[PDB]
UniProtKB/Swiss-Prot annotation:
The modification N6-succinyllysine is found at residue 317. The keyword Metal-binding does not apply. Its EC number is 3.6.4.10. Keywords: Acetylation, ATP-binding, Autophagy, Cell membrane, Chaperone, Cytoplasm, Hydrolase, Isopeptide bond, Lysosome, Membrane, Methylation, mRNA processing, mRNA splicing, Nucleotide-binding, Nucleus, Phosphoprotein, Repressor, Spliceosome, Stress response, Transcription, Transcription regulation, Ubl conjugation. One of its GO terms (molecular function) is heat shock protein binding. This is Heat shock cognate 71 kDa protein.
């Protein structure tokens, strides 16, 4: 037949994995990345998806779509939608109560339902899998946050159908993470697991109680507007200030300068999770001025201190609601690309009085990993 795949669809990135010969392989895309941006772009001549889309965002703000996960399954009159709209550089219109994204493709203006944008990303993932597997992918298990209602889940299932994917099942992201680590095996005991998920733009904390294979979400908390992007922003402002100090030039207005500076920062941030310092080299940032500088892990940590620290409040809240003390949680798994940050790992352990963190599986691949296993058994 055909190997069912596991797909995680995140607000900023997506990932696809497959279970074969007892091992789960996370499939790398055309650029060789193990995760693909959830970006879709429309130009005069083409429809760009993934890395190709994100790589040209500075040029096409109005026709480059993202955050479709924040729209999916919702209405236009939805307070959330009404708030989010204020920050997207693309158009969201009302179509009989449902929101739609309006872009210009090949001179003509077009509109898409949130699920159609997601189906585009889903198609890229399916494509990546097939290119690797050398076979056509039909069956799949897609992940969704635990707090998604039936409409949001419906729309995700739909986005899968559009892409020609037979969605075997939609499972929660935290549950997929648990399965990745094997925290679902029956041990004739009640296990309390805390899933700490800090991705690109969202922060989710979920306390699961696993009784004989059966998962039970006891509490959830977090911030839908706190993620790795907020950390990048802090770097940007910092460097803008420095440029204005060394050159007496404010580049805030120049959207190209800022958007290129941001890309440089996000990159330096990743290397800061291994090295203690990274350099920023950008040619002709503003006018013909080349911006050559660098940051240390120490400085980076200072810039996001309050943010990193504030991460513990949602954790305290989740425990409180679940009616558990720090000592009652058996396993803590790290999920989301942002958890690779050292200071975040330290901060969490200290809170759990030195308890060991589960983090051998790349945190941004954990959900995909778990869905792959789940997909495997489902076939
Ligand atoms: N080494 C690293 N250090 C810090 N952040 C990293 C590292 N590697 C990846 N990231 C960050 O992880 C984020 C992507 O996380 P992930 O791939 O889990 O996102 P996601 O599921 O789309 O997230 P969400 O749904 O929360 O937005 C980006 O902010 C990226 O900068
Ligand atoms: Mg994620």
């Amino acid at each position: 037949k055909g190997p069912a795949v596991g797909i995680s669809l995140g607000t900023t990135y997506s990932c696809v994995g497959v279970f074969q010969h007892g091992k789960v392989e996370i499939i790398a895309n055309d650029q060789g990345n193990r995760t693909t941006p959830s970006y879709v772009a429309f130009t005069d001549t083409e429809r760009l998806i993934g890395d190709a889309a994100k790589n040209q965002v500075a040029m096409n703000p109005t026709n480059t779509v993202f955050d479709a996960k924040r729209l999916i399954g919702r209405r236009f009159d939805d307070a959330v939608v009404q708030s989010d709209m204020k920050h997207w550089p693309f158009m969201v219109v009302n179509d009989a109560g449902r929101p739609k994204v309006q872009v210009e493709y090949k001179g003509e203006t077009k509109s898409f339902y949130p699920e159609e944008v997601s189906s585009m990303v889903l198609t890229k993932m399916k494509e990546i899998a097939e290119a690797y597997l050398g076979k056509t992918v039909t069956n799949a298990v897609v992940t969704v946050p635990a707090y998604f209602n039936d409409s949001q889940r419906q729309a995700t299932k739909d986005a899968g159908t559009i892409a020609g994917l037979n969605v075997l099942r939609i499972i929660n992201e935290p549950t997929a993470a648990a399965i990745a680590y094997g925290l679902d095996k029956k041990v004739g005991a009640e296990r309390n697991v805390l899933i700490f998920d800090l991705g690109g733009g969202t922060f989710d904390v979920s306390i699961l109680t696993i009784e004989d294979g059966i998962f039970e979400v006891k509490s959830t908390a977090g911030d839908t507007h706190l993620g790795g992007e907020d950390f990048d922003n802090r770097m940007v402002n910092h460097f803008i200030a420095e440029f204005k100090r060394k050159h007496k030039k404010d580049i805030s207005e120049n959207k190209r300068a800022v958007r290129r500076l941001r890309t440089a920062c996000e990159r330096a941030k990743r290397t800061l999770s291994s090295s203690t310092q990274a350099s920023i080299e950008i040619d002709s940032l503003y006018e013909g001025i080349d911006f050559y500088t660098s940051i240390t892990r120490a400085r980076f940590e200072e810039l996001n201190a309050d943010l990193f620290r504030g991460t513990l409040d949602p954790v305290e809240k989740a425990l409180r609601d679940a009616k558990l003390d720090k000592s009652q949680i058996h396993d803590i798994v790290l999920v989301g690309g942002s958890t690779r940050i050292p200071k975040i790992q330290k901060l969490l352990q200290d809170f759990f009085n030195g308890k060991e963190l589960n983090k051998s599986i790349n945190p941004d691949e954990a959900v995909a990993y778990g869905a792959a296993v789940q997909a495997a058994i489902l076939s």
